[PDB]
Each structure stands twice: as C-alpha cells, then as structure tokens.
C-alpha cells in the first residue's frame, strides 16, 4: 500500500541572494535524505537505486518544497533558513528570470488552487519514484511505486475535493514546469561552480559531480 497519511507525515516531519539560496539548498539536502527515508518503500529499494533516485530528483524536490513553503509570500520565496527572498533581490543579483518562473509557474499556481501538504507530498513522492532515472537495477519496481502514489493521490483528491474533478490532472500538470525549472536551476548552479565566485558547500557540490 501507499497511504497518503504516511506521505503527509513525511512532509510534517521535515518542516547576496544566490549565496543564501545555495547555502539553504545544501542544508536542505540533508533533510531531503531524511524525508525520502520516510516515504513508504523507498528505504527497501537497493542502496544504489536510492542514490540514483535522489541524484535524479533532488533539485525538483527542493524546488517544490520551497515553492509550496512560499504560497503566503508576496512576490518572494521563504528559505528553510528563515530568510525571505524577494523578486527585486533576485533580479538585482542577475537571476530574475529563473526566480520569476518559480513565482509564476509554481508558487502562484500552488496558491491559486490551495495545493495542500498531502498533495505536495504526493507530487514529491511521484518525482522521487522516477522510473526514467538512468541506471536503476529495476525500473519496473520504481514504476510500480509511482503508480501506487498517483492512485492514492487521485483517491485523496476525489474524496477531499469532490467538487473539483480536474484537480488531480491539475496537480500532475505542474510537473513539466517543475522539470524545466529544475533543469534551468542546474544550468545556473553549474555556472556558479564554473565562475567560482559563489561558495558551494559539500553536499550541493557532490550533487554537481559526474555520476
């Protein structure tokens, strides 16, 4: 089984600007590992596959988390360090475009639909169990777990928001945006690493290593 209550529990258990964002990201990578261990069946996968899923998903997973954390923030994001970062600050640091995509495609859409923590948890678990991740010893097994998450999520939405028949599809359709922003985020991080002005801490650095 894949009970949405366990997924919610996982979320609840873990609850210039470029430098601050990068520092916050490094910090949250530790927390991400703890989150993943709390998702049903993840820790039962082979260690090598747990590594692959987390290396494949970490940036989307962190982006989804700070985006949902920021739904009551006007034109900004709330980092896990407690720091609010506004649009103007990101623009003045040369990362306005990517920052605005986060705000318009993720944060404001999460706000508009009042995406809840169960739904966020499920989307994150779907991202985690990515069966397209290269090198998985058993892709079908990860595919099975993803299928169980989205079954439970659809059941949850239909029970909790029966007057919103499109809500489930609406949730899933933020995933392409999440993927694209995740990819653009990586491009920036690789550049910061290349230029070498911004400090990149050890876990974030490791995520930027070749496989």
């Amino acid at each position: 089984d894949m009970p949405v209550e366990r997924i919610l529990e996982a979320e609840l258990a873990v609850e210039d600007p470029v430098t601050n964002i990068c520092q916050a990201a490094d910090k949250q990578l530790f927390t991400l590992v703890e989150w993943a261990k709390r998702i049903p069946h993840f820790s039962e996968l082979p260690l090598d596959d747990q590594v692959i899923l987390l290396r494949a998903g970490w940036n989307e997973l962190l982006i989804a988390s700070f985006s949902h954390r920021s739904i009551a923030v006007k034109d900004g994001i709330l980092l896990a360090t407690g720091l609010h970062v506004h649009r103007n600050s990101a623009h003045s640091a040369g990362v306005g475009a990517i920052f605005d995509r986060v705000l318009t495609e993720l944060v404001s859409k999460m706000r508009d639909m009042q995406m809840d923590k169960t739904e966020l948890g499920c989307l994150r678990a779907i991202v985690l169990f990515n069966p397209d991740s290269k090198g998985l010893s058993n892709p079908a097994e990860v595919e099975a777990l993803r299928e169980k998450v989205y079954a439970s999520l659809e059941a949850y939405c239909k029970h909790k928001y029966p007057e919103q028949p499109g809500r489930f599809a609406k949730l899933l359709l933020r995933l392409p945006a999440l993927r694209s922003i995740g990819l653009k985020c990586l491009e920036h991080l690789f550049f910061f690493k290349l230029i070498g002005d911004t400090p990149i801490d050890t876990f974030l650095m490791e995520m930027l290593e070749a496989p």
């Binding site: 590992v33 590594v51 987390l54 876990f203």
Partner: peptide
C-alpha cells in the same frame, strides 16, 4: 557520492 551513501546507510 560519499555523502549521500553515508546518510542513506543510516
């Protein structure tokens, strides 16, 4: 990927 392995191990 030494950090991730160490943290997942437990």
């Amino acid at each position: 990927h030494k950090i991730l392995h160490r943290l997942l191990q437990d």
